[model samples]
Target: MQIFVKTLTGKTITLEVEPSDTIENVKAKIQDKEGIPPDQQRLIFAGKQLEDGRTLSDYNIQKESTLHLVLRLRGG
Candidate 1:
């Protein structure tokens, strides 16, 4: 299945992976593309935090779905 990912910096990237691919895998991919660390990655799908180790199937994500990866910002 292919999924569209949008980064916090307004960059978009597409990834093709099995429906069984875990959110962690997606996180790694995002980090690789955006240079964001996993700990700083905050991916939300349908307005909920995507827990690591959970597959796309677990979240009911279908082929050609769009997922948003918003970076967690901190500082005064």
Candidate 2:
């Protein structure tokens, strides 16, 4: 399935993913395309945070669902 990710910069990137892919896997994909570390990415869908251990299917994510990707602030 195809999912859309909206970045904090307000850009939408289209990604090809599988329902069985875990949140961590999706984050890795994003990293490959955007050069962001997996740990620095937080994905939000349906107004809830996606857990790393969970799959898209587990969250009932459908095709064309837009996930909001926020960057974690790294500072002391």
Candidate 3:
């Protein structure tokens, strides 16, 4: 019931979560550790964007899988 989030900057943070938890919850945890807002974090798993309303179980996500976290960049 846990997942690892690999940030774009090469930092990997492990989060203890439930499979039923939404992807948004995971992002919130990441934001605590990395200071990137959930809205600013683009969480990608299995080479696809993770929808906010989707649960980890929705994607059949497992602990063995790694979610990639990308910080959105803004243009001036």
Candidate 4:
């Protein structure tokens, strides 16, 4: 699977990945690539938040599919 990500800074990139990779796994990679902690990253696809435990295939992610990244909401 080729995972497409649109970062908060409006940069888009595609990552080579496996369908079975967990969201948390991707988050770690994103943290490494983008300098944001996993705790601060919010990943959304198809207008929904992607749960950490779920795999890319569980969300029916397609090749070069795009997912949006945002900062985790802070109440204060």
Candidate 5:
């Protein structure tokens, strides 16, 4: 399945990963593409927090879905 991902930096990336891919896998891919650390990443799917190490199936994500990954900022 294909997933469209968008980062907090306003960068968008499209990945072709299996439907079984976990949220952590998506985080890793985002880290690779956006150069952000996994620890600093927070994924929100349909306005809900996505826990790490959980698969898309856990959240009932459909195939060929799009997810939004927002990077947490520390300070101004």
Candidate 6:
């Protein structure tokens, strides 16, 4: 299945995903495509934060659903 990941600036990234795929897996793909590390990648779907160690299905994410991506700022 495919999902849309939208950034703060309106940049949307299309990712091929599976129900069994973990959040880390999704983050890895984002990191690969956008050069943003997993540690700094935060995915939000349906108003809930997508935490690692959990599957997409666990969050009830469906095909073609749009997830918002928030970047974790560097240490101050």
- Model 2, 28-69: lDDT tens digits are 999998888999899999889999999999999999999999
lDDT of 2 at 46: 85
In candidate 3, how many Å is residue 49 off? 0.5
Off by over 4 Å in 6: none
- Clash pairs detected, candidate 3: none
* TM-scores, all models, native as reference: 0.84, 0.95, 0.88, 0.89, 0.80, 0.95
Relative to the true structure, candidate 3 reaches a TM of 0.88
Clashes of each: 0, 0, 0, 0, 0, 0
**Shift of residue 17 alpha carbon in model 2, Å:** 0.6
Across 1-76, the per-residue lDDT of candidate 5 in tens digits comes to 7777877667778877775888888788877877889888888888888987788888888866778877778775
In candidate 3, which residue ranges exceed 4 Å CA deviation? none
Candidate 1 vs. true structure, TM-score = 0.84
lDDT of 6 by residue, 1-76 (tens): 9999999999999999999999999999998888888998999998999989999999999989999999989897
Clashing residue pairs in candidate 4 (N, C-alpha, C atoms within 3 angstroms): none
Clashes, model 5: 0
lDDT of each: 0.83, 0.94, 0.84, 0.88, 0.80, 0.93
Q: On residues 1-76, what C-alpha lDDT tens digit does candidate 1 reach at each position?
A: 8888887767889888777889899888877876778887888888878988899888998988888887777664
RMSD of 1: 1.6
The count of backbone overlaps in candidate 3 is 0
| Candidate 4 global lDDT | 0.88
Off by over 4 Å in 4: none
The residue-by-residue lDDT of candidate 4 on 1-76, one tens digit each, is: 7787898789986677788899999988887777788998899999899999999999988888999998887676
